[PDB]
Amino acid sequence: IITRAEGCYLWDSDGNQILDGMAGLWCVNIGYGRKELAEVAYRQMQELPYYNNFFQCSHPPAIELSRLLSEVTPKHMNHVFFTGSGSDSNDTILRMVRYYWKLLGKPYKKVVISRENAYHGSTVAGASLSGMKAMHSHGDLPIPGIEHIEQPYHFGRAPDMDPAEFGRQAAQALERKIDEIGECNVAAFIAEPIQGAGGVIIPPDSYWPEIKRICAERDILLIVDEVITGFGRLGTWFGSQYYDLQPDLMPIAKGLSSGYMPIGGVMVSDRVAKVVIEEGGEFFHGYTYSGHPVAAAVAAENIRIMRDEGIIERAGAEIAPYLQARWRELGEHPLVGEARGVGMVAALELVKSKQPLERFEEPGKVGSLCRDLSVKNGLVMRAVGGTMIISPPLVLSREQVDELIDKARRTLDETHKAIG
Amino acid sequence: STADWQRLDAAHHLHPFTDYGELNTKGSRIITRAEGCYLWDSDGNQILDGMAGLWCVNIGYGRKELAEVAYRQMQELPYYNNFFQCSHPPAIELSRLLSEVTPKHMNHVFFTGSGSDSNDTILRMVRYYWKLLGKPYKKVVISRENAYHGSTVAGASLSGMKAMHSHGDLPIPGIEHIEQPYHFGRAPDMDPAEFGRQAAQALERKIDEIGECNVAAFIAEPIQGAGGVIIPPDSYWPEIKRICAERDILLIVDEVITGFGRLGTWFGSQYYDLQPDLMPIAKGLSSGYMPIGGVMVSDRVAKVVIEEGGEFGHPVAAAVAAENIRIMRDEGIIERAGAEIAPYLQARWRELGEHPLVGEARGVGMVAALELVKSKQPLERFEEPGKVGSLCRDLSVKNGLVMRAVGGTMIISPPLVLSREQVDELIDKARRTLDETHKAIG
Numbered sequence: 001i002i003t004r005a006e007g008c009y010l011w012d013s014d015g016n017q018i019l020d021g022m023a024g025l026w027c028v029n030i031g032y033g034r035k036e037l038a039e040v041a042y043r044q045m046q047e048l049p050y051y052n053n054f055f056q057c058s059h060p061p062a063i064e065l066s067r068l069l070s071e072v073t074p075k076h077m078n079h080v081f082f083t084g085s086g087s088d089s090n091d092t093i094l095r096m097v098r099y100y101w102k103l104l105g106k107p108y109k110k111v112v113i114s115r116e117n118a119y120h121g122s123t124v125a126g127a128s129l130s131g132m133k134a135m136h137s138h139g140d141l142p143i144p145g146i147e148h149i150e151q152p153y154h155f156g157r158a159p160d161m162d163p164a165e166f167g168r169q170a171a172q173a174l175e176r177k178i179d180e181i182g183e184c185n186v187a188a189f190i191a192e193p194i195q196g197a198g199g200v201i202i203p204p205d206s207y208w209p210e211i212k213r214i215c216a217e218r219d220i221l222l223i224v225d226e227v228i229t230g231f232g233r234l235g236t237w238f239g240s241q242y243y244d245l246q247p248d249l250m251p252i253a254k255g256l257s258s259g260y261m262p263i264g265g266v267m268v269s270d271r272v273a274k275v276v277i278e279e280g281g282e283f284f285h286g287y288t289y290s291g292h293p294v295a296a297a298v299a300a301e302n303i304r305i306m307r308d309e310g311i312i313e314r315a316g317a318e319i320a321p322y323l324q325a326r327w328r329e330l331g332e333h334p335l336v337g338e339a340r341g342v343g344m345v346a347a348l349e350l351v352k353s354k355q356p357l358e359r360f361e362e363p364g365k366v367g368s369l370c371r372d373l374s375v376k377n378g379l380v381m382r383a384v385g386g387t388m389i390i391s392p393p394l395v396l397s398r399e400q401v402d403e404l405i406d407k408a409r410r411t412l413d414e415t416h417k418a419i420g
Numbered sequence: 421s422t423a424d425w426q427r428l429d430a431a432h433h434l435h436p437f438t439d440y441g442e443l444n445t446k447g448s449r450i451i452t453r454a455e456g457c458y459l460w461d462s463d464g465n466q467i468l469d470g471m472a473g474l475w476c477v478n479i480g481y482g483r484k485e486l487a488e489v490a491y492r493q494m495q496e497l498p499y500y501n502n503f504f505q506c507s508h509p510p511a512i513e514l515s516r517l518l519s520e521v522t523p524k525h526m527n528h529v530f531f532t533g534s535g536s537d538s539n540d541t542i543l544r545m546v547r548y549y550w551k552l553l554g555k556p557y558k559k560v561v562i563s564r565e566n567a568y569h570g571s572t573v574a575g576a577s578l579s580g581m582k583a584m585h586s587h588g589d590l591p592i593p594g595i596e597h598i599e600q601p602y603h604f605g606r607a608p609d610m611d612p613a614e615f616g617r618q619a620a621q622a623l624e625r626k627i628d629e630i631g632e633c634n635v636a637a638f639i640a641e642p643i644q645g646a647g648g649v650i651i652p653p654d655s656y657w658p659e660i661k662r663i664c665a666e667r668d669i670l671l672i673v674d675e676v677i678t679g680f681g682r683l684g685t686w687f688g689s690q691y692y693d694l695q696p697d698l699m700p701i702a703k704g705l706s707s708g709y710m711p712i713g714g715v716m717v718s719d720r721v722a723k724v725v726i727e728e729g730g731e732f733g734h735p736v737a738a739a740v741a742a743e744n745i746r747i748m749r750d751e752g753i754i755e756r757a758g759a760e761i762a763p764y765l766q767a768r769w770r771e772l773g774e775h776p777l778v779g780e781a782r783g784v785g786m787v788a789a790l791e792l793v794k795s796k797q798p799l800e801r802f803e804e805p806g807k808v809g810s811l812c813r814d815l816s817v818k819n820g821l822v823m824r825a826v827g828g829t830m831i832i833s834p835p836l837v838l839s840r841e842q843v844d845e846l847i848d849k850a851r852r853t854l855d856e857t858h859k860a861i862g
């Protein structure tokens with residue numbers, strides 16, 4: 001039970017100072033308690049609390065956010081459909097990516113390819129593209145049109161294979177799954193730049209360079225899911241430019257408003273923009289609260305804060321290096337096999353031994369603990385099975401990292417004992 | 421800046437439910453402000469909105485209490501998970517309140533980010549309640565043609581807008597659709613009651629083809645908002661309750677539009693003595709002040725899905741929505757709307773019923789529609805009636821009224837706060853708008 005929260009810190013009812021290294025839920029990228037946000041939300045609910053997002057008319061809070069996103073991501077992205085959540089964004093992407101192919105006269109290109117252990121929402125669509133299997137479990141989920149493939153989890157799958165060749169491989173597991181559905185039946189492949197909720201699953205640097213080749217030889221679209229990775233998480237404003245990707249569609253959410261408002265949307269490449277506006281008809285997809293003005297206001301201010309105050313540029317050039325390098329330092333711990341991270345996200349692997357390397361029978365019970373001990377030691381840290389992870393706000397300081405490591409290293413040293 | 425705002429809107433901003441292209445030339449209507457039942461666009465024109473914007477602004481605009489609680493809840497923590505939370509979190513209230521104003525048997529509620537998201541969950545858990553009752557073959561949900569139940573890939577499969585399916589093979593497994601009770605557009609002569617029984621017994625018709633063992637549930641909006649204001653012969657709903665019993669299936673009444681006073685009563689279920697098993701609500705749950713929706717869960721299905729099956733809501737939006745319901749009950753907004761102004765508006769809408777171009781004038785509560793027709797007593801429909809309403813809208817907006825065209829059906833759903841003097845404005849504004857459209861053809 002928390003009373004207050006400011007910057008990167010939380011305080012519970014007993015005074016308990018807690019460093020939220022989890023940005024709450026991957027989103028609070030400015031940190032808690034930048035009142036600049038509640039003022040503009042208070043003040044925009046005044047003029048217009050709500051008006052329709054385009055059915056007849058538009059409204060300014062949304063046009064402004066639209067420019068800003070056209071601006072942090074101008075490149076080939078200069079258009080944004082809005083929506084009420086990040087899962088609701090992927091529903092949009094799935095339907096319009098099928099509309100794109102329809103208008104080019106290929107209604108058979110309607111299969112989108114995801115990956116096992118991807119997360120792409122909670123809706124019926126979004127849970128079907130995601131490969132958690134715990135959201136598929138209700139019977140019929142992978143709705144027709146969805147196929148899934150290999151995740152590039154170098155550590156949990158093939159800990160020995162040359163990381164470079166393991167990347168190159170598991171990238172061709174896409175070129176595999178194409179010649180057996182049929183290129184002409186595939187509309188697109190969809191990935192998170194870095195799988196977040198599935199573990200901080202970082203591809204070998206070989207993976208993405210491959211997957212781009214594969215969407216060239218073949219006539220299919222790329223859908224990079226920047227919902228967690230977006231707005232500084234990878235040091236860069238978006239993962240697509242850490243991984244030199246030129247997506248066709250991007251769902252975004254969460255850090256769009258640093259979690260302070262229900263809001264998401266899909267950016268649209270100038271490629272798939274062209275086909276939808278011209279040579280196109282009515283787009284009967286749409287959604288009340290799409291560019292809801294209050295959230296658009298809050299989100300506009302949120303991005304406005306981030307570039308004006310230079311929050312992400314510091315995070316990526318000043319602090320991301322420091323965090324990643326200190327994280328690897330826990331790599332030399334008896335309980336830690338691999339230490340991963342790009343930018344402002346990272347993960348530790350909980351393992352029984354290092355030199356002969358044996359998993360736990362049920363690694364979840366260990367990680368499920370080790371987090372509950374980080375909180376009890378003043379640090380929030382998600383557990384995915386036996387993987388521990390952090391996704392801090394981008395306003396962390398070079399001192400708040402020394403805090404986070406030293407608190408993590410205590411939490412690890414403590415976890416070892418209760419087993420031994 | 422208009423000239424400039426409109427530039428940017430086409431330049432990058434995208435635009436739910438719109439050609440994208442036939443409106444980048446013509447420019448967008450940019451609305452800056454709003455208070456009461458009025459909006460103001462960039463040219464400062466006052467517009468009377470009898471559409472609650474999009475059926476939601478049941479409070480009427482510019483209600484200060486809502487921004488004050490939103491400013492205040494942003495001060496506490498966003499999200500409310502299990503390990504830590506905001507003391508006295510808004511989500512807890514709202515479920516107590518939402519339980520109080522809901523046909524009794526609904527005493528559990530699950531929150532979600534929209535009304536479409538809500539209908540997905542309901543699709544998920546309706547099959548999940550049958551699984552746990554050992555009938556996993558019970559998976560078919562049944563909507564009606566021209567119904568609207570959301571815009572997620574689930575919602576668009578569930579809604580009988582045939583314009584969203586044909587673009588591909590979208591209506592996903594497990595979804596069938598049936599006749600709508602549009603007495604005017606299907607059987608304008610048939611006895612209004614007989615059509616209701618016939619379009620309702622068309623449900624016992626489908627199940628006799630599919631197999632009772634396949635249908636999981638039935639779903640309708642008490643009245644279909646969108647597709648028109650397609651109000652059922654008073655015979656209809658008493659049938660569907662019968663058909664839904666002897667057949668062992670769940671009822672999903674969709675109260676997103678029809679919910680929170682829109683039909684004079686708090687909900688449509690109330691007005692039609694329906695006892696939904698699942699209720700998606702999300703338009704006027706916060707009177708549009710903030711994105712949020714959810715599902716009510718009848719005590720029946722709530723015991724199977726919550727209990728020995730313990731598996732499977734933004735806090736700031738929960739607060740706003742909680743206070744919106746508060747205001748509406750304390751200040752009797754919905755009680756008056758249904759007893760003072762609803763009978764009143766329901767009379768004078770029927771007046772426009774006999775302008776030279778009106779065949780039917782339909783209405784319940786603070787919702788209602790009329791039908792646009794070529795000749796009245798000779799009875800004729802328009803060739804491409806959509807082109808017609810397209811005009812009557814632009815003339816209603818320029819005559820200062822937001823009045824909505826679904827094909828050839830003109831609709832209004834003003835805030836519940838409309839005053840008896842404000843209907844005269846809306847009636848006269850519409851009446852002028854009507855004689856304006858009559859000339860542009862005749």
Ligand SMILES: Cc1ncc(COP(=O)(O)O)c(C=O)c1O
Nearest residue numbers: 085086087119120121225227228
């Ligand atoms: C990759 C990805 N896509 C979509 C989502 C949708 O989540 P939500 O519905 O909370 O916006 C998530 C959120 O992290 C995600 O990680």
Ligand SMILES: Cc1ncc(COP(=O)(O)O)c(C=O)c1O
Nearest residue numbers: 288534535536569570674676677
């Ligand atoms: C019955 C019903 N469900 C859902 C919706 C809309 O869903 P959402 O609020 O998520 O856009 C509407 C109208 O748009 C509706 O009338």
